């Protein structure tokens, strides 16, 4: 094929779109509604408009290149078309970037600046209450910012296949939202926040917990613990112009101390706990020849998916609490026993790459004697915002260490944030538990990677067992519906709602689609975790000294008695 673009001749054999071919050859073509290899089929944004000689104006993002095409990407007609579309978007957009949470990384603002577009008449809604939905424990909608680009709908479709995010006809105009415009929590929505990640503007956000945290910090009698998820140390640096794949653990500890948190712990400790319980439970099921399979339960998105689509699997879920909740429980029980603090004055805050964690933390039964396991959950973005608001020079901070009591962790706990990490850690402990030995080779590279469905045959003590890692909610649906679950007998199955694992969580920093083309964000974020695992002395959860001390001195033997009674949570289906 011979393609003429802006007077430049190309000879190619590729069968692709104008947009992709142009961007492969460093030709600038703007785009908005195009993301995840699809656009808004109904109301195309037409920001990707180009001029094809003989045909007229076309959308580059969904138009294949053809031999003889003469394309102009920067003609006056094209620019006036694009500018017109952007102006029409501005007509329904509250253009107040000042207090906006996407001010520093908004795509729409970049487009407005680029094409110098102005609204025909500024959209200044006086009461935004009709435009805002904050009923959810995880997600919030601000339709004064919504461009109706459909990116959240497509992302929900491709990531979860639930289509919990839909186009709706409200009042006679189109909005996006949950089924029947209900609160997302009350639908089949997983609260995974992939829709947020896909959003180019501030229309979709996480349910803020920053005020809980601030009020707790400023409350004289409250002792505020903070603990960050595995993924946070591999991600937040992005929001401080430090680049991708940068380990910023120590800087985070320092920043948290400067924020005024009273205790600095780590969720990876909780991960080691979860492994302590779950590996024990797995060995128990192995020696009892059942029941099989056992599913992980640490992902609240997956838990909600099971609740809403496969309740019969609820009794197959591990009873071990997630690292977050198990850490919280221990923070309300064990921690006061080694600190002298009044448990009621303890306020436990987690930092998560996840929006669903907010819902998990606010589950009614996630408490004991009137004390919440977790009192607040802030996302990576929220923590970054809190750091910036405090004018803390994050990139220049010196490394500090976490408080040891519930802050030490192994590499096994460290790799939790990546798909297949929980599986690998769990196997590392379970083999040692079952064989009553301390094995050398602990790396299970078969369960790693971005493959949607991963399988492995592991040999434990005498026999062989089948494990599966489900990478993404849509892949859970595929795994179940295709009957892959019935092809063989599975014994242990990991499920993560977000493809790539928690490193690609709904509470993670937004990334420019261009940088998304430049960088494999999932592998790069996971690389930090695996690198931490490689260079750590202890690489098994049961080799965690602080954790071993905690079990020996307080909880006793895992998987039973005190440990089972306090550190476990069971989901029950309804009759
Ligand atoms: N609880 C918990 Fe987890 C741990 O440890 C996080 O904190 Fe994850 C991450 N990163 C998130 O959110 S949840 C799913 N299990 C894998 S990792
Ligand atoms: S969504 Fe973007 S363009 Fe709209 S107010 Fe916020 S920063 Fe400005
Ligand atoms: S919420 Fe965001 S992603 Fe969804 S249609 Fe509106 S602007 Fe697009
Ligand atoms: S939170 Fe997840 S399941 Fe719910 S609408 Fe958004 S992408 Fe879909
Ligand atoms: S994979 Fe991780 S970030 Fe995504 S919903 Fe599950 S726990 Fe949250
Ligand atoms: S980016 Fe092509 S129609 Fe929206
Ligand atoms: Mg299309
Ligand atoms: Mg305080």
Author numbering: 2 to 576
From the article:
Corresponding to earlier crystal structure data, for all CpI variants a space group of P1 21 1 was observed with two copies in the asymmetric unit cell (chain A and B). For the same PT pathway position, different substitutions can have a dramatically different impact as exemplified by position E144HydA1/E282CpI. Here the exchange to glutamine diminished enzyme activity to only 0.4–8%, while the non-conservative exchange to alanine and the conservative exchange to aspartic acid retained between 46 and 81% activity. In E282A, two water molecules occupy the space of the missing carboxylic acid group (chain B, Wat717 and Wat974). The distances between these water molecules and the hydroxyl group of S319 are 2.5 and 3.1 Å, respectively. They are close enough to rescue the PT activity between surface water and S319CpI further downstream the PT pathway. As a consequence, Hhyd with its deprotonated adt-NH ligand would be stabilized in presence of H2 (E279A). In case of the corresponding exchange at the surface-exposed glutamate in E282ACpI, two H2O molecules (chain B: Wat717 and Wat974) invading from the solvent are able to bridge the gap of the missing carboxyl group (E282A and Supplementary Fig. 13a) thereby rescuing a large fraction of H2-release activity (~50%). The fact that E282ACpI is rescued by an H2O moiety while in E279ACpI and C299ACpI the gap in the catalytic PT pathway cannot be closed, is probably connected to the superior accessibility at the protein surface and the specific functional requirements (such as e.g. pKa) of the position to be rescued within the PT pathway chain. In case of E282CpI, a substitution for aspartic acid shifted the optimum only slightly to pH 7.5 while an exchange to alanine or glutamine rendered the enzyme most active at pH 7 and 6, respectively.
[FeFe]-hydrogenases represent one of natures’ most effective classes of redox enzymes catalyzing the reversible reduction of protons to dihydrogen (H2) at turnover frequencies of up to 9000 s-11–3. Their active center (“H-cluster”) can be structured into a standard [4Fe-4S]-cluster ([4Fe]H) and a diiron site ([2Fe]H). Theoretical studies suggest that the most probable PT pathway comprises of strictly conserved residues E282, S319, E279, and C299 (from surface to H-cluster, numbering corresponds to CpI), including two protein-bound water molecules (Wat826, Wat1120 4XDC19, chain B) located between E279 and C29915,16,20. In this study, site-directed mutagenesis (SDM) is used to investigate the PT pathway of two [FeFe]-hydrogenases, namely CpI and HydA1, which represent the largest (M3) and smallest (M1) type of monomeric [FeFe]-hydrogenases, respectively.
